Structures are given as C-alpha cells and as structure tokens.
Design a protein around this ligand. Structure first.
Ligand SMILES: CCCCCCCCCC[N+](C)(C)[O-]
Ligand SMILES: CCCCCCCCCC[N+](C)(C)[O-]
Ligand SMILES: CCCCCCCCCC[N+](C)(C)[O-]
Length: 707
C-alpha cells in the first residue's frame, strides 16, 4: 500500500553483496540484511548507521552523538585498527588512520550488511562482516524531488534528487542528487556542515548492456564532536556525586575537524549470450581530512595519567575530579583505486545447474599523513566540578577556551609523519550449484596483500607482502512452503600493520566461522524471518608481550558464539513491522592480559523492534504513525573488564502525512523524534578514559516535494 510496505519487503529479497551474483536471500548461505531506499525515506536516518538499526548482530551507536564515521562493530569485531570496513558498489572505500569516508544516506538506493567472514569474495576483511552501500542510479521514469528539513540544534537541510532520460528509449539517462546541511553538534561549541553532490549517468545501448558512471563529491568544513570522556562524570559519578552533562565538550573552542571526498567510477554489466555475462566495477577516489583537536584523556586519578606532571601536582583526593587532555593536529590525503572484474557462467551438468563465478579484484591505497600529537603535559586540565553543576545540566554547558595549536612544544609534543601504502590483488572462484531443492555454494579466493610504510620523521620503512587463501562453502535447502535451512563454513584474513619486537610487521589475523540457521522467505505473503546461530573465531590476535615490553606479540585468540534473529512483515495493509534480537557471547580465548574477558563495547544482549501504522480511511487518510524501540544490553568499558556501561532503551517515532491529498501527490511532510523520552545514557566506552554520551532527543521536520 504505502512505499515501505511489501514493495520494500520484496525488493529486499534480492541481493548480491553475499555472492557477487544476483541471488535471493534464502539462496544465500550466510547471514545478510538489506535496507531499502523506501525504508530510509521513511525512517530518515542521520547516517547509514541508523539505517541498519533494526538489524541483528551490529552495534551502530557505539560512539554516541558523534557522526564523524560510520563505524560498526559486527558480531563482536571491528577492523584492523578500528578502521571502517565499508563498501560502496562492491568496491571497498579503503581508508587509513583518520582518513575514512562516508556517504550520505540521501545518496543511497540501499544498504546491505554481510555478517561473518567474506574474504572469500572481497579479500582482507574483518571477521565480523562488511557493509555494502549502493549508489542511487538513474531512474526509468522521471524524478524531480526537492526536500527541506528544519530541526532541533539548528538543523537546516536542503536537498534534491532529479533523474531523467535524454532520449525516449532511454539508452541515455542521468541522476543528480545533492545536499546542503548544517547543525550544531550535541556538544557545546561544535558544529557540523555538509555539502554533497552525486552525478550519475547510465548508458543502456540495448538490453544486455549497462554502463553506469557513478560519481560522488563531498565537502565538510566542520565534522563535529569526536572527543573522549572519563567514565568519571559519565558512567560514574564525580567525587561530588554529580555528572558531566550530555552536551559537555572537553575540546578547545577552536577545535576544528574537516573532510573532503571526491570519487569517479562506474558499474558495468554485459550479458553476452545465455551462458556468459561479464561485469566490471571500478572506482577512483581522492579524499582528505584535517583537524585541530583537543581531546580528553581521563581524570588525573586514572592509571593512564600516572606520569602526568600537571596531574601529580594535585591533592591525591582531587586527582579524580580533574581531566587530563591532549591534542592532535592532522593533515592527510589519500588516493584509492579499485576494479573488480568478473565473468559469470551459467550452465548445467545433467540435473545440476551452475552459476560459476570467476573473477579478479584489485586495489591500491595511498595515504599521506602529517600530524603532531600532544603527550602527557601538552594541555591545561579541567575541573569537572563547575561543569558538573545542576546549573549546567539545566542552562547548558559552557564552551572552554582556545588553545594554541601552533606552539608545538617539543617538550610535551611531537610530530607524526607517515606515508602508508596498501595493494591487494585477489583471484576467486565460486559456484552456486542447484540440484533441485539443494543449493550448494562453494568457492575460494587467494590474495596478494602487500603493504609498505614510510616514517618520514624516523626516515624508516616497514614492509610486508602477505599471500592468503580463504574459502567458504555451504548449503541451503529450499522447501516450497518457504523454509530455507542452511549452514556453512567461511573464512577471512586481515594483515597487521603493527610491528613487533623483532622490527617486523606481524603476520595476518584470521577469521573462522561455522554458521547454521534457517530463513523463512515465503513467496506468497510479504514476510521474511531469519534465524541463525554461529561460532566465529579470530586467531593471531595481537596481544601483550608475556614479558613486559612495549611490543605486542601474536598468537592471541578471540571467540564470538551467538544467535541472531531478524524479522520484517506487512501485518495488514496499514501495519508494518520489522525487528530483531541478538545474543553475542564474545570471549578472549588466548590472551596474555585478558583470557576470559569479553571485549569492550559489545553487549551480550541487544534488540530492537519497529512498527508503523498507516491510515487510508476517515480524515486521517495518508497519515502514518510509527514508533520503535532500540534495546542495548550492558557492556564492558575496557579490555580489563574493570567496569561496566549499562543497558539502555531508546524510543523513536514519527508522524508522516502523505501530502498527496492536497494534489501534491508523491509529496509528504513529516515529523521525526529520536530518543523520544530524551533519555541520558552513555553509549559505550572503549576504555576508562574513552566514553561517549548517547544522543539526546532530536526533532526534525521534513518536507519533501515531488514535481
Ligand atoms: C579487465 C581489467 C583487469 C585489471 C587488473 C589490474 C591489474 C593490477 C596489477 C598490479 N599487480 C600488483 C597485480 O601487478
Ligand atoms: C523483539 C525482542 C525483544 C527482546 C528483548 C530481550 C532482552 C533480553 C534481556 C536479558 N537481560 C538483560 C535481562 O539479561
Ligand atoms: C525493544 C525491546 C525492549 C527490551 C527491553 C528489555 C529490558 C530488560 C530490563 C532488565 N535489565 C536490562 C535490567 O536487565
């Protein structure tokens, strides 16, 4: 009935991120979720992150109110370094250090999250999973959209989406999506600004051929808050019994953070005859980032400030209500090129049909870093006692003061100049073989992953080339009542970039996952229900030197066993629901300093559930009301597990009015409120000095008009 209904449910039955062939989800041997454009058009997520909010096995809010990155912890793990493991159009948006790129969800057609290992199809990748976003492409029918938004915290967004054919047959079409946004961050003194234009052009010379040029250009002068808060004044009280308020900001007042993104590429597909289709996906990007940032580093009483002179210089009983701060100045610039070429051969073997994928994937990334870091006594301290007042929780925080980012005292501060390079060439093969009600997926990939690192300050150079194989295989049994039981085994690998006591770069870490579960994907009614349970293991995790040095040592091992269930269904033509539940038991299996502990930021239990009700009768016709709940279980705030961050439940809702009924059909007006009950929670902590206030209640009005 309404866009995000079953038209959405069913469009999402289909995917490709999991097999690199266009396959429906019950024929996919691995856990995979899909979120459609109609859905983001309903929910209006600030980022790709919120877009996956009702999906299992993923924490999307770890960093709370910050929006700088779309970082996701999946099935308990994150990538080498805490780097994003994000794809756009099947190709990796490879970043490095603070140079990580994001794509606005207004420019997306869909997003898919693939859980567990997938090196079998993409190369070095985090066990845990990967995120694949898909660019809006030119439309068959015309589209002329203009959208306006006004919200709390001074959000003003203006954007458009126009697509048309240049000929009546449509061999030529384009799309141009753009947006201008600005708001002030939840934290006092921080703002956000974004400018983004995505020009796309499709060429279908006929119907067995498609070349779509995909481009994206984004400028962000200000990215906003990305600071660190002590568990003291957030999770826990300050010695005075109080807390830092949710809008508090430990940074300078002249803290500045910016990103620049430009990309050009294309998606290409050509079906030659009945057995041979070829597709090539390619992209080039040049992205940049800068920042001047003063950041928190815990209270003076925190182990991490043992050696801080401004901290030792205080009354023992004060140490725990004062804040050590550091800083960084960064300038970076990277280029990333990618091409994946694949040949799909469909054919039979008697009563056995095959879809045989064979392809070569390549990328190179270069990132040039030139920064400077304040060490132990590089910046003033802060008394969290004034901040802590009820005055402030009530009449707001107060900006701090400037900070000379140029006076770089060699005393307490240093330069960091690195030039990183990565290359990976992989060849993979896979077959989806179906013999009646059996679908068997199996293939493997081999990778040449080479890196090189130059340290311009030490004038030194670290290199390592890895050579890796990974494979995966599984079966999905297809029952026509709509029941697809499946299971499989899969792997992934990930090079280290760290260097050990012997002056060398450690070896790769690896991913090993056993998964089984079933998928209820009924062809008659608009419902999808999936359930899965899995054993995922990461080996060769870098750990602490059993012998007290400043180097890590390898051989560590972490395990995540878990359960995930997702469910989406139209319940009546006016009621739709979607929701999930996740159970993740993650464990340090082999570790110098932590066997038995669970890793920070990952809850044992999480869940979410959403419902929308649309009204087609009476005088409330074309009025949608929806509301949802997101449950985040308790979690540890440090590898030591010395403390815990608590469970929370945020409630979101909207009311949308289908303007249609005043002529303007296809237009609509909406009102969205996130964290309806304006709850105060700490999102997570990655350590005792690294904590994050969750997002305080937001209100946004959106008017989207279709000419
Ligand atoms: C159909 C075009 C395929 C392009 C393949 C790109 C080759 C990259 C070669 C670089 N390498 C390090 C492997 O020699
Ligand atoms: C739609 C499913 C809702 C599931 C909510 C699950 C909460 C499990 C809580 C376990 N607990 C935190 C009490 O230990
Ligand atoms: C949207 C699902 C909401 C589930 C809420 C679960 C609350 C569990 C409360 C018990 N506790 C967290 C304290 O263990």
């Amino acid at each position: 009935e309404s866009a995000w209904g079953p038209a959405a449910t069913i469009a999402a039955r289909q995917s490709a991120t999991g097999t690199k062939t266009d396959t429906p989800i019950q024929k996919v041997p691995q856990s995979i979720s899909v979120v459609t454009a109609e859905e983001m058009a309903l929910h209006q997520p600030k980022s790709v992150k919120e877009a996956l909010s009702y999906t299992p096995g993923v924490s999307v809010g770890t960093r709370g109110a910050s929006n700088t990155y779309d970082h996701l912890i999946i099935r308990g793990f994150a990538a080498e370094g805490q780097s994003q493991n994000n794809y756009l159009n099947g190709l990796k948006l490879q970043g490095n250090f603070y140079n990580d790129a994001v794509i606005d969800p207004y420019m997306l057609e869909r997003a898919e999250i693939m859980r567990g290992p997938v090196s079998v199809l993409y190369g070095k990748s985090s066990p845990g999973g990967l995120l694949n976003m898909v660019s809006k492409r030119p439309t068959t029918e015309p589209l002329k959209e203009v959208q306006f938004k006004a919200g709390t915290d001074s959000l003003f967004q203006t954007g458009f989406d126009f697509s048309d054919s240049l000929d009546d047959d449509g061999v030529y079409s384009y799309r141009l999506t753009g947006l201008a946004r600005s708001a002030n961050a939840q934290q006092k003194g921080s703002e956000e600004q974004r400018y983004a234009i995505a020009p796309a052009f499709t060429w279908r010379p006929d119907d067995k051929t498609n070349f779509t040029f995909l481009s994206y250009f984004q400028n962000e002068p200000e990215t906003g808050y990305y600071g660190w808060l002590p568990k003291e004044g957030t999770v826990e009280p300050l010695p005075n019994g109080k807390r830092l308020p949710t809008d508090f900001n430990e940074g300078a007042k002249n803290n500045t953070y910016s990103r620049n993104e430009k990309m050009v590429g294309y998606s290409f597909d050509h079906e030659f005859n009945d057995t041979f289709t070829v597709r090539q996906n390619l992209r080039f990007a040049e992205n940049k980032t800068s920042q001047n940032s003063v950041y928190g580093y815990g209270v003076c009483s925190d182990p991490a400030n043992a050696y801080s002179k401004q901290c030792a210089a205080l009354a023992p009983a004060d140490k725990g209500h004062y804040l050590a701060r550091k800083y960084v100045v960064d300038d970076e610039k990277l280029q990333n090129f990618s091409v994946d070429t694949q040949l799909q051969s469909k054919f039979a073997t008697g009563d056995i049909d095959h879809t045989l994928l064979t392809g070569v994937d390549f990328m190179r990334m270069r990132n040039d870093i030139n920064a400077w870091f304040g060490y132990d006594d590089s910046v003033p301290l802060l008394n969290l006692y004034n901040p802590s007042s009820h005055h402030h929780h009530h009449h707001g925080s107060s900006v701090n003061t400037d900070f000379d980012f140029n006076a770089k005292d060699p005393a307490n501060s240093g330069p960091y100049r690195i030039l990183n390079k990565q290359k990976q060439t992989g060849v993979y093969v896979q077959d989806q073989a179906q013999w009646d009600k059996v679908l068997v997926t199996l293939g493997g990939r081999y990778d040449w992953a080479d890196q090189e690192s130059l340290n311009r300050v030490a004038g030194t150079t670290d290199k390592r080339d890895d050579k890796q194989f990974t494979w995966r295989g599984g079966v999905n049994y297809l029952f026509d009542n709509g029941v697809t039981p499946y299971f499989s085994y899969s792997e992934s690998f990930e090079p280290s970039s760290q260097v050990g006591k012997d002056g060398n770069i450690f070896a790769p870490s690896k991913g090993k996952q056993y998964e089984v579960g079933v998928k209820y994907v009924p062809e008659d009614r608009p419902i999808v229900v999936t359930g899965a349970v899995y054993n995922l293991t990461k080996t060769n995790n870098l750990m602490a030197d059993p012998e007290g040095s400043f180097f890590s040592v390898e051989g560590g091992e972490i395990r995540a066993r878990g359960v995930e269930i997702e469910a989406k269904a139209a319940l009546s033509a006016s009621v739709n629901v979607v929701g999930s539940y996740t159970y993740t038991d993650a464990e340090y299996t082999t570790d110098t300093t932590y066997k038995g502990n669970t890793p920070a930021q990952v809850p044992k239990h999480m869940a979410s559930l959403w419902a929308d009700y649309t009204f087609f009768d009476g005088p409330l016709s074309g009025l949608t009301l929806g509301t949802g709940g997101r449950y985040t279980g308790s979690s540890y705030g440090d590898p030591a597990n010395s403390f815990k961050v608590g469970s929370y439940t945020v409630v979101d809702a909207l009311v949308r009015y289908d303007l249609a009924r005043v002529g303007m059909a296809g237009s609509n007006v909406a009102l969205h409120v996130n964290n309806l009950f304006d709850r105060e929670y700490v999102a997570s902590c990655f350590n005792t000095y690294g904590c994050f206030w969750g997002a305080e209640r937001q209100v946004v009005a959106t008017a989207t008009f279709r000419f």
